[PDB]
Amino acid sequence: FGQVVADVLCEFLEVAVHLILYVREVYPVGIFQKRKKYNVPVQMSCHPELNQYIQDTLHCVKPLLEKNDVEKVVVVILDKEHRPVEKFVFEITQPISSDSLLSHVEQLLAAFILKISVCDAVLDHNPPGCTFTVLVHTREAATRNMEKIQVIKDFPWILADEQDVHMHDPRLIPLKTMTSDILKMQLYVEERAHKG
């Protein structure tokens, strides 16, 4: 059960991240290809190392998703100096095996993708030179998690800095909320007052 919900979320978050990367021009347009998921046009990256990086990131998270130990998955955008400008927070909440209800929930997720696709319509451009990162917030205190989250040796995870997180102001900009009996997730952006 709770296992397949993870596969879904993992499948989702993977696309979201690729789209976010395009839409915020974190990488150039020429490495992306248009595909379709969630019966929608997306941009996925054809750079294998980048793809591998993301797959890896999300293989690791999968197992915590199953136990509903994850509270947030945040994509973070960092500038040249190395300070977080934007953040795509995906806040998760989870409450006996379905079928159509599963595809319903899955299709819905397209509402989100479509927000990300046009979000630029509401954010202010980033400065040239940005990179990203993914942070996972646990409901409980990162550490039982710590042994479990190293699913892929060679892809290790550490504990976050105050550096990595920190960012006053910022500005909150909602994007989508959804509620099912089995999954609730809200995606919004926090966005440094001065990107410069």
Binding site: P28, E49, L50, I54, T131, H137, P156, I158, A160
Partner: peptide, 21 residues
């Protein structure tokens, strides 16, 4: 407190340009 991140950073923009036309 509750916050994990991959040790590794993703491919830089430059690294990626080398492979494109």
């Amino acid at each position: 407190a509750n916050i994990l991140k991959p040790l590794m950073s993703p491919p830089s923009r430059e690294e990626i340009m080398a492979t494109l036309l």
